[PDB]
Amino acid sequence: NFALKPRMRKIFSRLIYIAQSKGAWILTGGTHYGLMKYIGEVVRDNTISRNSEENIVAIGIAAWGMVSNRDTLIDEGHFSAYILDNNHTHLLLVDNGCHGHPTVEAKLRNQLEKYISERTSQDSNYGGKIPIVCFAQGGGRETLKAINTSVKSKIPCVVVEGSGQIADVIASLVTSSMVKEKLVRFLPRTVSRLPEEEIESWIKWLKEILESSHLLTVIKMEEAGDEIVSNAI
Amino acid sequence: SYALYKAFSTNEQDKDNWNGQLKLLLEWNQLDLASDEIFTNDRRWESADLQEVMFTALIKDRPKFVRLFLENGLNLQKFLTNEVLTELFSTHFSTLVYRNLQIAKNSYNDALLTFVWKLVANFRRRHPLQALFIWAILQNKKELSKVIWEQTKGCTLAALGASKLLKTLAKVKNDINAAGESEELANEYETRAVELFTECYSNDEDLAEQLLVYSCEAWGGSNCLELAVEATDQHFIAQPGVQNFLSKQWYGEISRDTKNWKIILCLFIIPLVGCGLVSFRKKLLWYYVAFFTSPFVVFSWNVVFYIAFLLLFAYVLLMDFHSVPHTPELILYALVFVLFCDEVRQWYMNGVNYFTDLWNVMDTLGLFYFIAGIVFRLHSSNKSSLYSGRVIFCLDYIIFTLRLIHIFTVSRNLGPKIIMLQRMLIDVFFFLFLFAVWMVAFGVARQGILRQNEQRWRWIFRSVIYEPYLAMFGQVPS
Amino acid sequence: VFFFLFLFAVWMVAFGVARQGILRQNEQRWRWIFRSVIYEPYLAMFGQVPSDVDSTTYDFSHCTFSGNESKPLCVELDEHNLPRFPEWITIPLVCIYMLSTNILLVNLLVAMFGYTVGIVQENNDQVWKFQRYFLVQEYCNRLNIPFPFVVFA
Amino acid sequence: ILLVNLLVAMFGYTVGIVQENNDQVWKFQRYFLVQEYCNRLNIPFPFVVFAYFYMVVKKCFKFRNEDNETLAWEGVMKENYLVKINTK
Amino acid sequence: ATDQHFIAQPGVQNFLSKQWYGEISRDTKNWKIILCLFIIPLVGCGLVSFR
Ligand SMILES: O=C1NC(c2cccc([N+](=O)[O-])c2)=CCN1c1ccccc1O
Ligand SMILES: [Ca+2]
Description:
The structure is cut from a larger assembly and holds 5 copies of chain A.
Chain A: H1 6-22, E1 25-28, H2 35-50, E2 57-62, E3 90-93, H3 106-118, E4 134-136, H4 141-152, E5 158-160, H5 166-171, H6 176-186, H7 196-209, E6 216-218, H8 228-232
Bound molecules: Icilin and calcium ion.
PDB class: transport protein
Keywords: trpm8, transport protein
Entry title: Mouse TRPM8 in lipid nanodiscs in the presence of calcium, icilin and PI(4,5)P2
């Protein structure tokens, strides 16, 4: 579940407008639940409002172990009732073993990011190289693992907001003690369900985050007018 | 409320009781507190447990909380069942509003109010959001109505139907305060419909004209353009989008950026259709049919026909009118039969509202006087019946000639002035009232001072009414 | 002016044909059709009140009985050699026509003139001094001597 | 004199009021003439009675997806219009 | 005091109109009232509203 306040609503509407103006791929999870619902909604709306001039490309990358109804074909399927989202125009589902396995798609996702980041396409203004931006807004282990796999790789261009769960704990501080102090002050109801043997691991994750502060940027609260997403990216 | 919430949250027994916290913050108006520390963590949302609190926020006028609930997710059409609508229109529906609805259905009846009287009779004993919108808009809620209006699909139709309902309910004379608020809310939604459709037109023309013609699968049983007409919302039609739609529909196949004199010049010379003088943008027989299909030229052909009919009527009536009908009288009866066929066609394709317009009434009356002149006219070898038939045709010619003023209301130049002409009736009647009073007073005084005991009625009304009437044109009674 | 002339022509044609049809019978002369249909209802705009509708102020010394001399035809007579036309159908007809054209239709033109003068006056000075360009550029362009000698030049 | 020149004044005042509304009322009335001359399948006039016999021929014998597409189009400018209202 | 703006407001005008029609309600049309005036025994019908 996800809270859709009109500020983040405006930000992601502006984001999908920028992705239509530039002709960009948007990589995402692709399930029916939460933010990807709203991304599929705004993709469908910008598709239905113009119906031409570079119809946009959204790739959902899922795990295949959380999908309830699965059809093995060669023959189009009819998926109905994690549930996949209706409006993502491309889907890729990674093959692995049993059902209850989160964090499977992240390896192929980050390797695809790395390959397009080293892919050369000279018909641009970036000196080729197809520039790549990662966005984080919310919370979870998947967010932090994705940000560190990005910033470990070249061209991460990690952008966060000033509202969320981990976007607040990264936005506020830009050693171990201050990481502990922020993580207990912005997440009150998550620390109780966590052993400290991986909380120190999270401290190591965030210390690997803050190594390259030139590869990370933030959207602030005073900066709340129009075209702030372009001014960030 | 904040003190009670701090006392309710820190009991260390009901920290799992988010429902009690939400109902406590609903009974008070704490929107910001419920946004900050209920819906923040994304920890436990069920999205279907929000129904009784939804019903309470509806019946207790909490528009910001239902905005928050739809912001966090609830399906209206899943929620809004017939039991909910009967509980709203049966229990939560006011009783003074129902009396004003009775008075409005008795004294100001209409198609849409008959429809909403039928549906409110349905639910006090399938488009759910529209019925909830009617419930909220009748009650003059003014702020829950906007929240549900933002969720609807046929938004322009909803705004025009609401403006029509409220402009009808603003005419009930008792409880003038409720009439005032319903009038203000009517003006707000007709402003809202105009300002939405001007955006829908200013982005795309074709899909806006797609919007104008849809009936929303019996919304109220009518159309967006029809609802704008039936409410006399002339500002919605005086805007350039609907006027551009109407002008493009009026010229037909011919483009609008051609001059009119080329069009009427190609009208008079019939085989001139095959030349590069007119533009058919908006092989050779398609040019022929696309010229002779358009409303512009069938109207112009029809008025040329009507002028030729008036010339034939005048020739027959003044210069060739004998005891037996000659050839142009029979041609005249044929043309009147053609006009009668058109009028019974229009009475068939309209029905009972055909008799609403006064022009159709005097139209049928003129046809009746024509056939009465025929049945006086055929009794030949009787000079009195023949003369009476000709007098009947003369007064009928007056009627037929004065119809031409109503014909030429379509013009860009004469049209607005002919429409302006019917706003003068109250000034003309005030003039005739004062002139009749002065005329009667002077006429009876002069007839009484001069003469003595006139016994003839004709020479009373020539000397009391007629000669002081002529003294208005500068006669000075002698 | 053209709106006035349209309405006045419609009323004038209607009254003229109705009066000529009620009074007389089968006029064959075109000039005395257009004198009695168009011309006399036209003069009734200047306050004339068309005459031969009253049947008491009508004499038979201005007729022809058949078109032989200048004068109009008589009203078509009875078997008792009386005028056939009803006064109660021609006196209120002339009264309605005379009200409608001499008073309503002229005082409407006064109102429309007053409204047009009310609009165009703040633009009138601009349009005049825009037109001033053309007269200055036709009287400053040529090398012009005074007029009756110009042909020598 | 008095009673006719009062009528002139009242006509002038009524023309002074109703003129900014007159164009609106004319182009509102334009709807009815367009919808009576665009409704029927009409040939030019003196032959129309023959086509009337064609209707006698009648008495001699006798959810949609693009709608949802254009309503979904309408919702986008509704959202843009609400953005503009709150932007003011 | 000739304070005509105090009487040209809708409250006093509503008071005066309700006092002028008397027992008949104001949201009935006038032609029904004068039609029932000319035909005197027509008072016993459902044409006028006495609210
Ligand atoms: O169709 C028409 N029927 C009659 C009509 C037909 C029968 C009798 C009478 N009448 O006596 O006033 C009038 C009026 C003129 N008319 C017409 C012609 C051309 C353009 C627009 C029009 O409205
Ligand atoms: Ca008609």
